[PDB]
Amino acid sequence: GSSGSSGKKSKYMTPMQQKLNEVYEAVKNYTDKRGRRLSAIFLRLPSRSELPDYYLTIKKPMDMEKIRSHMMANKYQDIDSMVEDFVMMFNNACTYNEPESLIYKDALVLHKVLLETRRD
C-alpha cells in the first residue's frame, strides 16, 4: 500500500523529517578519495574580527550551521528547500576560493553528491 499528504507550512511532526537529516549527515560523513572531510572546512567560518576581508568579498555568507540549526528546529519544509541552499554554499566558494585549491574541486563533489541523494 501507499499514501500521501500536502499542506505543510508550520512546525508539525512528519516522517519526512528523517530525510532532511540523513541527507545532511551524508554530506558530513562523505570524505575524499583518501579520508579528508570536505564539510570540515565548511563547518565553522572565521568571524569578522578574525577574517574580516572575507565578509567584504562574500556579501551572502552561508555556513553548514545555517541549515542544520534551522533544520533541527523543524524549520525547513522539503528537501528541495535545503538543497537550493547548499548550492549557494558552493557557488560562492567557486569565486571566494581559487580555481586551483582543495576547497574548489572538493566543493563540486559535495554538489554532485547532494544532487544524487534526492529521491524521486
Cell numbers 577574517: residue: 51
The CA distance from 104 to 97, in Å, is 6
Cell numbers 567557486: residue: 94
State the Cα torsion 50-55-60-61 to the nearest 10°: -20
Amino acid at 3: S
The 8-class DSSP code of residue 18 comes to T
DSSP for 27-90 reads: HHH-B-SSS-BSSGGGTS---TTTSHHHHHH-SS---HHHHHHHHHTT---SHHHHHHHHHHHH
84: number of CA atoms within 13 Å, CB side?
6
What Rg, from alpha-carbon coordinates, does the chain have?
16
The CA distance from 54 to 61, in Å, is 9
Classify domain 1-120 at the CATH topology level. Answer: Histone Acetyltransferase; Chain A (1.20.920)
Q: What's the N-to-C CA distance of the chain in angstroms?
A: 17
Residue 91's closest CA among 108, 78, 77?
108
Assess contact for 86 and 47: CB atoms under 8 A.
Answer: no
Assess contact for 23 and 82: CB atoms under 8 A.
Answer: yes
Assess contact for 62 and 92: CB atoms under 8 A.
Answer: yes
Assess contact for 104 and 98: CB atoms under 8 A.
Answer: yes
Q: Which residues pair with 13 in a beta bridge?
A: none
Domain ranges of the chain: 1-120
Assess contact for 112 and 27: CB atoms under 8 A.
Answer: no
Give the technique used to solve this structure: NMR
